Symmetry: D3
């Protein structure tokens, strides 16, 4: 049983770590798939984001971090995944996640989207929010893996 | 080896509910469709009727076990050695209640993980409540129900 | 030639409801304000009282016909040769229920099209429920009701 | 000099409610925790029980006065010379009802300003309703309640 | 009775066709009005979008496709329309549609906004979503008129 | 008792005037704090926005208009404020305001976020909406202070 947790992870946060850890307690192999998402003008390069996530997830034995620029449905097929994992935060993410999952269902009917709910600790953060706080030299230590907080400060210097 | 519970009132089970258990059977080894007595909700069908309707409507699914329960849902999942809790996600108003509910279940049973599945567009606007409402007012609900459930619902409304 | 039905409980009719039918009379040739008995809701006013209050409060509108009905709303719209179904949109929680409702009505009567009108900012936060709640607790609701309806509501609460 | 009222059913008071009054005591000179009888809601605890539980659970707060009231909330705030109306904001479904409610209170008492405080993440998914539901079904609710309230809730459910 | 269905239509989708078809069963003349919307950086030019929509709607006798860069209220007056049609998809579109309709009511009180609900088939697609799927060479045949799908592939080649 | 009403105010609207006026009836001193927000590409410069807001609020004795580019929590501390005021319009603003307030609570626990509700009159406008209407030469007289409407037309000429 193979599941994919896709996202921009720009950068990966403790909310993302929360979700991927719950996915490893539930599925045999989880692929943390980092979308290139160049339309989003990500702060970190795909190679940067893959490196940050690999280091931030190394203590989790059954997580494989991979970058990709493909269509999600094609990449899920090529990875032999039948489960797509997405974290559910708020009502505005939810409605977009539904359009997404229905689109992914259209493109790959046997690829099933499942939504996990993060801990309350991370229920109000996002990559975007942490980055804006860090641009104003605010403390984001609590929201990020050490390697990621270390790298985020270096990139904003 | 992964044991998943899909709990609910199933008053009666609908094609949306069938959609959800069928997707859950494709992900987990054993799925327990747990029918809560929910005496608080004053159900149209008895718990045995709901179990019977749910059993025959899921009978073609090899790894579904239809079971009733009157315990607190977390207390039942613990006793069933279930680690996955299945919930179907319809609209945003379901979402907000599901979130409170899942945080409560996590407090009560941290090792029980709540999982949200998404129904087909076909069933994304029906509920047991609405279907019953339409049938109480002589509206056609055949499209939303298993055949065995449509006959029990028709038979129940004649009297 | 276009026949539109605006159904609801109207328990009692409010200035928000008047806002909606008045905008509907500017778009369609004949508007049927259909008062559902909604015995399920245990209404404060009787169906004849609601019809009477609604008739006089809409009497200045030439193409409004106030009618009661106890059928399923789609069954009534079919028999009235109505092809437009008017619903007033208040807030997002109305929206989610209106969407399920309209998909149900489309299943039951495809040729009946559901249309959503938007009330004035003035009435975008009132409902029959809230107005009644405030008046049961001796609050001023004069601003939200037609004069004839405010007197029936005052008279109904004295006893 | 600023007098603030925090009204509600408090059936029973929870740690979310304590969170809100405690933040309100840090902003306003005197906070009135107003316990509405809400006979409409068929409360689990009597009004005197709710006042007593709320008094001891807030007793460490110097500028909190726990008071019961059966008037319309605006009528009570007027008589208490309160100009700030405290409401706790949980999720989006609370928001939509709070907005209608606050516009109503502004109509009834323009000089009473509604203020929305945000609870801790800890209590952002609990309510009196859900806690009671879990405890009626033999679930652990110790984490969500003041100690004095957990004993009254345990004692109330034994019989 | 004259109604306007305005939008960016970048490009027009089967959801848009759904809504405009329902409007023609309800009103005598419907003007599918394509807003230039240069703030949105549309993928297709206004002339491209007007051509695509004209061809995609030709089988509907009482639809007139027009482009415009005016203020909506002025354009509705100049077209002798008293009805503004908008399709309602999700909760996040809804709140914006309300600010819009109230603004349009302020500018032209007799111009009434009416909201139609698309079929479940199109309740989870958008121009944006289809375009992103097509950028990754995903099948969007089901969501578009043939001429529009044909043109969307050519523009992404 | 010192409260801060922060925002982009690009430009300040009658909804903003509504909220700040309610804050002055409730707190002793209100600081209308204008965030530089260069990520938003504001139409008016920070100096322009501060000038517009000062003039638009001059009749309110206990409002001090200030611009800032700092972290909100640091600026609130430096102004000796313990109250952060935000206006609540719709469900989509609400969820973002929660992530914000929880972030600000993390950074400054004693800085309490409080939400005021504007009048129905301004419950459907935004700086963004007014600006788009003014770009199409639409009447925005009703939504803005005179000095701000006067300046908005000049900037769009
Ligand atoms: C980012 C996560 C994701 C999950 N599902 C799809 N996505 C993306 C997406 C968005 C919208 C349309 C298509 C796609 C797509 O096919 O791939 C993407 C990975 C780029
Ligand atoms: C795109 C559809 C639409 C429907 N109603 C208005 N719009 C647009 C708009 C958005 C926001 C403010 C003003 C306007 C406006 O006046 O015209 C636009 C056509 C550009
Ligand atoms: C604009 C109002 C505001 C209120 N609270 C914070 N903000 C902004 C913000 C957004 C997101 C992350 C950090 C911040 C921040 O620290 O300062 C900003 C002023 C730039
Ligand atoms: K998340
Ligand atoms: K649409
Ligand atoms: K505002």
């Amino acid at each position: 049983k193979r599941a994919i947790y896709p996202g921009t992870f720009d950068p990966i946060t403790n909310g993302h770590i929360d979700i991927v850890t719950r996915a490893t307690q539930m599925f045999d192999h989880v692929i943390l798939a980092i979308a290139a998402s160049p339309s989003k003008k990500p702060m970190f390069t795909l190679e940067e984001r893959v490196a940050l996530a690999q280091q931030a997830t190394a203590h989790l034995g059954n997580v494989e971090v991979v970058g990709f620029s493909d269509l999600m449905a094609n990449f899920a097929r090529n990875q032999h995944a039948t489960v797509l994992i997405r974290g559910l935060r708020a009502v505005a993410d939810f409605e977009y996640e539904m359009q997404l999952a229905h689109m992914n269902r259209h493109l790959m009917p046997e690829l099933e989207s499942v939504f996990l709910m993060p801990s309350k600790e991370w229920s109000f953060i996002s990559s975007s929010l942490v980055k804006e706080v860090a641009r104003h030299q605010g403390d984001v230590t609590h929201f990020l893996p050490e390697n990621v907080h270390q790298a985020l400060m270096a990139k904003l210097a």
